[PDB]
Amino acid sequence: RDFNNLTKGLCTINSWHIYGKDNAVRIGEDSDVLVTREPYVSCDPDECRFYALSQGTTIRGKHSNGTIHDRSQYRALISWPLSSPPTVYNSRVECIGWSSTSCHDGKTRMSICISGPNNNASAVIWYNRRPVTEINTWARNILRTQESECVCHNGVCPVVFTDGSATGPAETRIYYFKEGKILKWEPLAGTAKHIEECSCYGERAEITCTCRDNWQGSNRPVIRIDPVAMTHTSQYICSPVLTDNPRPNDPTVGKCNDPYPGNNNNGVKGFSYLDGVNTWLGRTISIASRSGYEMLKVPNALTDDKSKPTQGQTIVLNTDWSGYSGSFMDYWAEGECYRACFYVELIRGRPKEDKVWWTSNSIVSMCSSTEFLGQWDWPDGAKIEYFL
Amino acid sequence: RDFNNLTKGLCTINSWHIYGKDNAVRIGEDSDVLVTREPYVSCDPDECRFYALSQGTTIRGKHSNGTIHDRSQYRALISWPLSSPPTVYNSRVECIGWSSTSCHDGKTRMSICISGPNNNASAVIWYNRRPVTEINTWARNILRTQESECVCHNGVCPVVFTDGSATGPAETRIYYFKEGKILKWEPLAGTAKHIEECSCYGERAEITCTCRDNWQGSNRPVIRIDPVAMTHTSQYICSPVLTDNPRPNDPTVGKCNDPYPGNNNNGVKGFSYLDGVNTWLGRTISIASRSGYEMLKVPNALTDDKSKPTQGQTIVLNTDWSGYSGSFMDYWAEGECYRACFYVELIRGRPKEDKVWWTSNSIVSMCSSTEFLGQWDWPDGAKIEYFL
Amino acid sequence: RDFNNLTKGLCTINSWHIYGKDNAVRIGEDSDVLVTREPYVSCDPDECRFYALSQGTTIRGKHSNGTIHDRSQYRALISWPLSSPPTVYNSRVECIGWSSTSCHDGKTRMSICISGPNNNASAVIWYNRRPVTEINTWARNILRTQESECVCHNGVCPVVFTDGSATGPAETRIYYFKEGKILKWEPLAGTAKHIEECSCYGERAEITCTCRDNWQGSNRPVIRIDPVAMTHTSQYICSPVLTDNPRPNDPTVGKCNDPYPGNNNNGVKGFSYLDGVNTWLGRTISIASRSGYEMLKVPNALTDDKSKPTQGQTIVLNTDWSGYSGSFMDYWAEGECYRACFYVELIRGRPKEDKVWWTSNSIVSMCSSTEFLGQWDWPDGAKIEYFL
Amino acid sequence: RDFNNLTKGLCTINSWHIYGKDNAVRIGEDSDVLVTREPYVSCDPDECRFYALSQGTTIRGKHSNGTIHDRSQYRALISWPLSSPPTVYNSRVECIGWSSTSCHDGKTRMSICISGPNNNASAVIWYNRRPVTEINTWARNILRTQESECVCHNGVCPVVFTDGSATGPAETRIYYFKEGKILKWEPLAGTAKHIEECSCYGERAEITCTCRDNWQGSNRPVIRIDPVAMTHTSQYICSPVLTDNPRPNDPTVGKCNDPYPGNNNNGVKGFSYLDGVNTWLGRTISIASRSGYEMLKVPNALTDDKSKPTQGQTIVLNTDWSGYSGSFMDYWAEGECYRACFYVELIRGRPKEDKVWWTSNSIVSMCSSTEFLGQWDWPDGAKIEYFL
Numbered sequence A, B, C, D: 001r002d003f004n005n006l007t008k009g010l011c012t013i014n015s016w017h018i019y020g021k022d023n024a025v026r027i028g029e030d031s032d033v034l035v036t037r038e039p040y041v042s043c044d045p046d047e048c049r050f051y052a053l054s055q056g057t058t059i060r061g062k063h064s065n066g067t068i069h070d071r072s073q074y075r076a077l078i079s080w081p082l083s084s085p086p087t088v089y090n091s092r093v094e095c096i097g098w099s100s101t102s103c104h105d106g107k108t109r110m111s112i113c114i115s116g117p118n119n120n121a122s123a124v125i126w127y128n129r130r131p132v133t134e135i136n137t138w139a140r141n142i143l144r145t146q147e148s149e150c151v152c153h154n155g156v157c158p159v160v161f162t163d164g165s166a167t168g169p170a171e172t173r174i175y176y177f178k179e180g181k182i183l184k185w186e187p188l189a190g191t192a193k194h195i196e197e198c199s200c201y202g203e204r205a206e207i208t209c210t211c212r213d214n215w216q217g218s219n220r221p222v223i224r225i226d227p228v229a230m231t232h233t234s235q236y237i238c239s240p241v242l243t244d245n246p247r248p249n250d251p252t253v254g255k256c257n258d259p260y261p262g263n264n265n266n267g268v269k270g271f272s273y274l275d276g277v278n279t280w281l282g283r284t285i286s287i288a289s290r291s292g293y294e295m296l297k298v299p300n301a302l303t304d305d306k307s308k309p310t311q312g313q314t315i316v317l318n319t320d321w322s323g324y325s326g327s328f329m330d331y332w333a334e335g336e337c338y339r340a341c342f343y344v345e346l347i348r349g350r351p352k353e354d355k356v357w358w359t360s361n362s363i364v365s366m367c368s369s370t371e372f373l374g375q376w377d378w379p380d381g382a383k384i385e386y387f388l
């Protein structure tokens, strides 16, 4: 009924508790589970749901062959109930396309899907489950967006798009939507040199996005957005605890205003919570592949170029596959503070498990606790041999 | 709560954006997807849904053998959520029969199914999901209707029926319903010589239907209906851009008040938006079979017998199957104008793909954008070899 | 919100239009459809649904072997949306048992299931989806009830039960429920000599039930109930158009107050609408087995022992299986009169189709039209060979 | 809208009537039914549902191999509609973990799942389907809880947890929750020597729990809780009718304040209704394995150490498998008293049926009748040979 406002700060993060897990690849071995990738989580005022890009086939279906490809006419943003698997019978299609974001502004949901050939893509912006605005490609090279939820404040929902090269300068724009209409857009500013796949959260009337510099950086770019002024800035996480993948080994000193070098032309969607001493970074455990997942408390990671971990939690062991990770919060929970949450995509099949013809994923998701909770690890759990 | 009134004009159509796609044949290769044909789309005030005639069997079921036949006791109008596939578990049966139409008047939904042997068919008119009126065959030769949504204005929902020959003069009637009760009916008037399968839209208190002349015309007949006076007229699209299928090659000058000759006794359901310079026509790309699909901006197509395209958009490549197409709009969207939409049925299996015993379809649907958006093509996406 | 009152008479019945058909055995050949029998239809104020006794297994499941048996611990009254099939995923369990009835009183639904061994059965009466009353067997020989909907008037819902022999005198009782509580019960009165499986309808504050005399009668017993006085009487349909099965050939004169002889110890659930000249009887076409189904207009069938048909309609051809049939009406439809409806169970598998190990059914249902509509036939449609 | 208060006493229990049965293993032989164990039943004000711990795989899925294990990352508390099976498509995930409880306080539902390795487990307390409180392991040895519903009074919902050895003294705590927040907790008091898996019910402002002494007792410990004072006590059922499993033969005199010896280090979740002369105890019929299930009326079982049965009812024959059993009541039923209900888990597969690689269960549930109803037996009904 009223637009949500980001009026709280982050709760104190002392560990992470289990929130949701769908076991999709395990279940889908013998039931009608859609092939997906690029999942995330997003809340409405009365319900939190899982989101992902469907590949328009089941896992056991013969059409799962070739689902390593990212962009086809058979993809769609779907959502489904928390910790269920994305099945043919319980998945709701939000919009058609192969890159997406979605967020609820307190009154209703905006969802954005991009589709088209590489040189001629377009975003359709849906609001209250109707298409309202369309944006054509501006650089004719894979118009793409967050692949995790956007955040709204007083009806204003900023969204980061990038169009242009994955391996060289690109054109990044921040659109400021309200009711699916464009209030304003800006070209990227500040010192981030390449932006993809922003993972975002809102607190005290500011939106923080941790992104992927695909071109040069193994540290992550950060965009900080003021949704009232509709202005933003960008920099990198200063910390030497480097959080992209693949990446070089951690140094002793990071970079604040440039890419930390050592790996070019590659990366993974990731996230952080940047809140002074209450700062936690996610990363794959492996420097070489999307294997393992950990949370590291790195006080002042954003601003301190020598900051190292003071605490940590294993999410996925290094002998298990991970993938994309991103941020969401239940903005509508009761209580004095916003509880940080994240999900990790657990990718299975190709390219690393190539005895199957498909690529898919399941989801694990955690939220922060002010307790110091015991840790477990949360693998996908499927036996690929079963699919042979 | 109030009856809807057609109080807006059409938005400016500068391209088409993707709206819905169900990927049904791909998904149904390995999940419980009903065999269908004759699909369409229709909105309620709070939801838009996919509609089709079920064949009362799944695609992988052995009973899909023989589903090339149009009329059986196993067919029913079903609806299901936008861009989901029509599954056994998520499909709602509207009514029983093998020819249908459906539309929401602002307060509730009217659905019409016709069933029976060829010589003794009957329409049952359902309103608020209860049968209210029944109409017996008047020419004892396949009583049949639109196979796409009707349109209502102030409670009045006109519906075009035809009973009689597919290959010679037939008896076409326009019924004017309100709350499922017949207010009036008229025999066809004006210069259209044969009418089937009207695709209709409403704007500024008038309903425009683009139909199929199965007997003689490769140009399409048009019925224009005044739902307040409850009167109508008919003519043909004047344009030489001919839009039935199969059809002769395009001439330089069309016919306004007679069938454009060259193909007899055949056709496909299609549609147009006829709005002065804002006029767009759909057609299969092939003149010979239901292959490919394009949208052509043909200013004044209705009234100008020399009008040629000034713009276009590919929907389905000519190396992919199409099928029926039709019109719908979300009459309940907020905004100053009605956004034109359409769907294309993508038919698979028999008669052209005859290594399978079944015939089915998936759906793609688009709405108009006031942007000039990049184009993609939208095939069914299924590999028939997988079903062998 | 208010209790429904039977304030209307029957509409004029001039033919029957198709209402619902689930095609369950066809669909269930390759999807998760529950094995059922003893189906019926019943309306709530906002929805009409299909009802049946599940056998607690799918048709393709190995546990369908043996489902020819009527009474097991694996049976339950289920309901599901009109013209859908009873699937594992869309069926709601009303109550547990192997004999049932159900009806909505205008405020909420009463459902009754009987379970137990033959000598120790009990009815549980559910109201607003909670168990409220229980009734123990009184004759220790298969306590059993209607297998089709009950009818309510001002909160009073009479229900006919029989306990005792199927082939000799039994103890039949009429319970008068309100909010699931017993207001009163009576032993059977009038001249009916054996009662099973009453099919009931309500009009002008009276409830009429057409039942099965299993012991001696090939004419059907009738119970007429006054739900305000909570009293009833019974007789037989006088007409020589005999409507049980199996049955002797039709004579020229029937019996009003005794069983019409010729077949002993056998029968089928059936129904009629007894309304002076507006009287229609259902019967299987075959005198020998549950094959075919027709509706016959037999003016004054109840009271005229020489009355013969003046009109008719084929529902199921004599080369197709039928089964149980029963009455229901949408008491909540708008309009000046109650539209008569019925369903026919289309039984497949054992005992007549014994190359399969299972017995199941699909449903067809019709309502009356004041038009003279063309007729079709409505078989189950499944090919048993597909299940071999 | 208001918190529920335990203002009624128990109805008179004169027998048990059938309430719910899901036939899950039968149905799941050929449909997408999740593998489960540790089921229970719990009501909301408008709906009663089945609950269990999923194993994150279907029964026919290859991942069912190994589901004899109790604790994995693939488990979750799920709920589903009464007497449906827990399917992939109709199951709602309450929370992630391998030990649980859940109860509705009149305004909304609290659910609690525990997850983690054996030495580092944690409880997450969800309220209104959001995580609110987390509790870390205190004895670093499988933190575990009830595995059946909790009970609330005026917003206060006590919950029994145990952390520590299964075969020696452990640390049991009673947490008093309100809106998912901890109001208070107490260490176990009174004379019970070991507590696991409390089955609880509420009447006249007191909560009674019948638990499992795994270490020494074949009589059951009882905890009685005052949810207004937030205090409790504990003792054993005095009766010589011993109700754990496995167990020695029944003696003539029981123990009130110590474990009845004869079996060490083993047991089964069970329940009783302790209400003076209106006292009923459940037990497996076999003393040696989880086979058979009966209800025994044992007047004053709680307080009389020589009390023997005066009445009984067979629930499951001794030639059929049983398992866990527990208590629930519909606190929101209308009427002068609370109707006692219980469920029995019918375990199938390993360890006793070891030709299959999986372990799963179905559910049967009964409520009390003030009639003396005939008895049936209620086995799972599945043929294990079908799964070979």
Ligand SMILES: *[C@@H]1O[C@H](CO)[C@@H](O[C@@H]2O[C@H](CO)[C@@H](O[C@@H]3O[C@H](CO[C@H]4O[C@H](CO)[C@@H](O)[C@H](O[C@H]5O[C@H](CO)[C@@H](O)[C@H](O)[C@@H]5O)[C@@H]4O)[C@@H](O)[C@H](O[C@H]4O[C@H](CO)[C@@H](O)[C@H](O)[C@@H]4O[C@H]4O[C@H](CO)[C@@H](O)[C@H](O)[C@@H]4O[C@H]4O[C@H](CO)[C@@H](O)[C@H](O)[C@@H]4O)[C@@H]3O)[C@H](O)[C@H]2NC(C)=O)[C@H](O)[C@H]1NC(C)=O
Residues within 6 Å of the ligand: A240, A241, A248, A249, A250, A285, A286, A287, A294, A295, A296, A308, A309, A310, A311, A312, A313, A372, A373, A374, A375, D119, D120
């Ligand atoms: C029950 O549950 C408990 C809660 O989960 C669990 O306890 C938790 O245990 C985990 C696992 O050990 C702890 O996580 C670690 O935390 C480390 C930080 O803590 C240390 O440093 C602080 C500052 O100097 C100290 O304050 C702190 O001391 C305090 O706490 C102690 C408890 O553990 C207590 O005993 C003390 O008294 C004191 O009060 C403590 O000494 C953190 O450093 C560590 O992360 C690094 O190590 C991991 C390898 O294990 C890496 O995977 C990770 O990436 C980090 O190392 C990498 O990066 C560093 C920073 O850049 C580099 O310096 C390293 O060299 C290393 O770099 C290599 O690896 C990278 C990754 O592959 C690569 O990219 C690089 O290039 C390079 O190759 C870890 O997070 C956790 O904090 C505990 N939580 C709590 C509340 O105690 C308990 O164990 C469970 N109990 C049981 C019985 O099972």
Ligand SMILES: *[C@@H]1O[C@H](CO)[C@@H](O[C@@H]2O[C@H](CO)[C@@H](O[C@@H]3O[C@H](CO[C@H]4O[C@H](CO)[C@@H](O)[C@H](O[C@H]5O[C@H](CO)[C@@H](O)[C@H](O)[C@@H]5O)[C@@H]4O)[C@@H](O)[C@H](O[C@H]4O[C@H](CO)[C@@H](O)[C@H](O)[C@@H]4O[C@H]4O[C@H](CO)[C@@H](O)[C@H](O)[C@@H]4O[C@H]4O[C@H](CO)[C@@H](O)[C@H](O)[C@@H]4O)[C@@H]3O)[C@H](O)[C@H]2NC(C)=O)[C@H](O)[C@H]1NC(C)=O
Residues within 6 Å of the ligand: A119, A120, B240, B241, B248, B249, B250, B285, B286, B287, B294, B295, B296, B308, B309, B310, B311, B312, B313, B372, B373, B374, B375
């Ligand atoms: C990114 O996305 C962009 C947006 O989609 C995309 O640009 C789009 O490109 C398509 C594909 O080319 C364009 O569609 C065509 O539009 C044609 C009309 O435009 C021409 O004519 C106008 C009037 O004379 C001119 O105003 C116009 O010029 C303007 O626009 C230009 C941009 O393209 C620009 O460069 C200029 O500066 C200027 O400002 C332009 O010249 C339209 O004619 C065409 O349709 C015909 O051709 C198709 C074959 O491609 C047929 O399939 C179709 O049916 C039409 O031809 C048939 O029918 C005609 C009419 O009857 C006959 O005359 C023909 O002979 C032919 O008949 C045969 O075929 C029939 C079908 O099988 C058969 O039935 C007959 O019997 C016979 O056999 C097409 O629609 C589109 O408008 C562009 N949109 C926009 C906004 O620009 C861009 O390419 C993408 N970019 C990248 C990098 O990939």
Ligand SMILES: *[C@@H]1O[C@H](CO)[C@@H](O[C@@H]2O[C@H](CO)[C@@H](O[C@@H]3O[C@H](CO[C@H]4O[C@H](CO)[C@@H](O)[C@H](O[C@H]5O[C@H](CO)[C@@H](O)[C@H](O)[C@@H]5O)[C@@H]4O)[C@@H](O)[C@H](O[C@H]4O[C@H](CO)[C@@H](O)[C@H](O)[C@@H]4O[C@H]4O[C@H](CO)[C@@H](O)[C@H](O)[C@@H]4O[C@H]4O[C@H](CO)[C@@H](O)[C@H](O)[C@@H]4O)[C@@H]3O)[C@H](O)[C@H]2NC(C)=O)[C@H](O)[C@H]1NC(C)=O
Residues within 6 Å of the ligand: B119, B120, C240, C241, C248, C249, C250, C285, C286, C287, C294, C295, C296, C308, C309, C310, C311, C312, C313, C372, C373, C374, C375
């Ligand atoms: C398009 O749709 C139309 C609507 O459905 C359809 O027309 C319908 O056609 C059907 C099929 O013929 C009609 O049903 C029959 O109706 C018979 C009654 O009507 C006759 O008798 C009346 C009174 O004497 C006359 O008023 C009436 O005349 C009027 O109507 C005529 C239209 O048909 C018109 O032409 C006239 O001008 C006039 O105005 C008419 O003559 C009815 O008797 C019949 O049922 C019996 O026959 C069936 C066999 O076909 C049996 O299956 C059925 O059980 C009945 O016979 C059995 O029982 C009788 C009574 O006991 C016995 O006397 C018989 O001997 C027989 O008994 C044997 O069989 C039993 C069953 O197996 C067995 O149990 C016994 O032991 C014994 O073995 C049938 O219902 C229908 O009324 C028409 N409806 C309308 C509105 O016209 C039209 O055909 C379709 N059009 C096309 C082009 O396809």
Ligand SMILES: *[C@@H]1O[C@H](CO)[C@@H](O[C@@H]2O[C@H](CO)[C@@H](O[C@@H]3O[C@H](CO[C@H]4O[C@H](CO)[C@@H](O)[C@H](O[C@H]5O[C@H](CO)[C@@H](O)[C@H](O)[C@@H]5O)[C@@H]4O)[C@@H](O)[C@H](O[C@H]4O[C@H](CO)[C@@H](O)[C@H](O)[C@@H]4O[C@H]4O[C@H](CO)[C@@H](O)[C@H](O)[C@@H]4O[C@H]4O[C@H](CO)[C@@H](O)[C@H](O)[C@@H]4O)[C@@H]3O)[C@H](O)[C@H]2NC(C)=O)[C@H](O)[C@H]1NC(C)=O
Residues within 6 Å of the ligand: C119, C120, D240, D241, D248, D249, D250, D285, D286, D287, D294, D295, D296, D308, D309, D310, D311, D312, D313, D372, D373, D374, D375
């Ligand atoms: C239709 O439905 C009817 C309703 O269900 C059904 O009638 C019911 O029948 C059952 C099955 O018989 C009855 O259950 C039993 O009830 C016994 C108690 O009743 C007796 O004792 C009372 C007190 O002394 C008497 O008041 C009572 O008399 C009254 O009622 C009679 C009706 O039956 C009537 O005829 C009389 O006139 C009178 O008015 C009656 O005599 C109860 O004792 C019994 O349970 C024990 O026996 C079972 C074996 O069948 C065990 O499985 C069970 O565990 C109990 O025995 C074990 O434990 C005892 C206590 O500790 C020990 O003393 C025993 O030795 C034994 O111990 C061994 O076994 C244990 C379990 O394995 C093991 O752990 C031990 O270590 C040891 O090895 C049973 O519950 C029921 O009450 C009837 N209900 C009603 C309302 O009548 C009727 O039969 C059905 N009709 C048809 C036609 O099918």
Ligand SMILES: *[C@@H]1O[C@H](CO)[C@@H](O[C@@H]2O[C@H](CO)[C@@H](O)[C@H](O)[C@H]2NC(C)=O)[C@H](O)[C@H]1NC(C)=O
Residues within 6 Å of the ligand: C002, C003, C004, C005, C106, C154
């Ligand atoms: C059916 O008839 C009964 C009996 O007349 C109606 O019941 C009355 O309803 C009114 C207003 O809702 C009450 O205030 C009276 O107390 C009712 N009872 C009696 C015994 O008079 C009932 O409303 C009618 N049902 C419908 C749908 O109109």
Ligand SMILES: CC(=O)N[C@@H]1[C@@H](O)[C@@H](F)[C@](F)(C(=O)O)O[C@H]1[C@H](O)[C@H](O)CO
Residues within 6 Å of the ligand: A285, A286, A287, A288, A289, A291, A292, A318, A319, A320, A321, A352
């Ligand atoms: C799931 C898995 O098996 N992940 C492993 C790690 O356990 C570790 F062994 C590692 F060496 C590493 O990168 O850290 O290799 C990866 C992985 O095999 C490769 O990077 C790519 O093939």
Ligand SMILES: CC(=O)N[C@@H]1[C@@H](O)[C@@H](F)[C@](F)(C(=O)O)O[C@H]1[C@H](O)[C@H](O)CO
Residues within 6 Å of the ligand: B285, B286, B287, B288, B289, B291, B292, B318, B319, B320, B321, B352
């Ligand atoms: C899907 C497909 O393959 N469509 C093709 C067109 O690609 C083209 F090649 C064409 F020649 C034509 O009609 O335009 O043939 C049709 C088709 O094969 C036939 O008309 C009928 O068999």
Ligand SMILES: CC(=O)N[C@@H]1[C@@H](O)[C@@H](F)[C@](F)(C(=O)O)O[C@H]1[C@H](O)[C@H](O)CO
Residues within 6 Å of the ligand: C285, C286, C287, C288, C289, C291, C292, C318, C319, C320, C321, C352
């Ligand atoms: C479905 C079917 O085939 N029904 C037929 C009728 O078509 C007819 F041929 C008849 F003779 C008859 O009873 O009327 O036989 C029955 C049936 O075969 C038997 O009664 C029992 O086996």
Ligand SMILES: CC(=O)N[C@@H]1[C@@H](O)[C@@H](F)[C@](F)(C(=O)O)O[C@H]1[C@H](O)[C@H](O)CO
Residues within 6 Å of the ligand: D285, D286, D287, D288, D289, D291, D292, D318, D319, D320, D321, D352
């Ligand atoms: C289901 C079943 O077959 N249960 C039987 C009882 O019928 C009975 F025979 C009994 F001896 C007994 O314990 O009471 O054995 C058990 C069981 O086989 C074992 O205890 C463990 O293997």
Ligand SMILES: [Ca+2]
Residues within 6 Å of the ligand: A212, A213, A214, A215, A216, A217, A218, A244, A245, A263, A265, A266, A267, A268
């Ligand atoms: Ca990078």
Ligand SMILES: [Ca+2]
Residues within 6 Å of the ligand: B212, B213, B214, B215, B216, B217, B218, B244, B245, B263, B265, B266, B267, B268
């Ligand atoms: Ca034509």
Ligand SMILES: [Ca+2]
Residues within 6 Å of the ligand: C212, C213, C214, C215, C216, C217, C218, C244, C245, C263, C265, C266, C267, C268
């Ligand atoms: Ca009989």
Ligand SMILES: [Ca+2]
Residues within 6 Å of the ligand: D212, D213, D214, D215, D216, D217, D218, D244, D245, D263, D265, D266, D267, D268
């Ligand atoms: Ca024990």
